[PDB]
Design a protein around this ligand. Structure first.
Ligand SMILES: COc1ccc(S(=O)(=O)Nc2c(C)cc(O)cc2C)cc1
Length: 193
């Protein structure tokens, strides 16, 4: 009925604000008030939708070390569909969905989860998930190098190719793959939330 519905709608809006102040407190409010089911999948779907949520707060919640948060991270990554996307296309979408936290161990966990998912979704591209991880950071580094004017000397394709020798189970990645990723980043910098 109507009274319950209107009160719930306002409470949801309050929960979102609470989340943005402190993600754990926000989710606690939504759970305790039966506005959100306390499962990894439902929490992850809530964060992926991201309505009225600050992307920095989303990344903060996703980078917590405790069991439920780890499970939400895994479920959240599983919501991304990377089939038939090149690595840059996939990274654009992932990196837009939340703002990475500052802490190296958290970022490592997030990018490893990303790497695993990309590779599962595109099994023929990289035989090793280490290769996918290293090349993911290679792309992020190229984005900065090409598009940050503080980097006063811009790496050409040949340089990008040379920097990634040996990471394909001891061999090299296909030149055309690297060319496609280089061109993609050159032509469109990553958007940060
Ligand atoms: C140490 O990890 C990183 C990861 C990505 C980047 S970046 O892609 O150059 N900027 C960025 C960062 C920091 C966070 C985001 O959620 C999205 C973007 C685009 C910079 C550093």
């Amino acid at each position: 009925h109507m009274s319950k519905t209107l009160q719930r709608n306002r409470k949801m809006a309050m929960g979102r604000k609470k989340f943005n102040m402190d993600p754990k407190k926000g989710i606690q409010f939504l759970v305790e008030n039966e506005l959100l089911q306390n499962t990894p999948e439902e929490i992850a779907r809530f964060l992926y939708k991201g309505e009225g949520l600050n992307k920095t707060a989303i990344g903060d919640y996703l980078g917590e070390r405790e069991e439920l948060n780890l499970a939400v991270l895994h479920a959240f990554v599983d919501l991304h569909e990377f089939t038939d996307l090149n690595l840059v296309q996939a990274l654009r979408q992932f990196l837009w969905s939340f703002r990475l936290p500052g802490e190296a161990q958290k970022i490592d966990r997030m990018m490893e989860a990303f790497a695993q998912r990309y590779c599962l979704c595109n099994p023929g591209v990289f035989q090793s998930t280490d290769t996918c991880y290293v090349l993911s950071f290679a792309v992020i580094m190229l984005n900065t190098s090409l598009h940050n004017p503080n980097v006063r000397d811009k790496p050409g394709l040949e340089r990008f190719v040379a920097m990634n020798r040996g990471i394909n189970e001891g061999g090299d990645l296909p030149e055309e793959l690297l060319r496609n990723l280089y061109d993609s980043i050159r032509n469109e910098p990553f958007k940060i939330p």
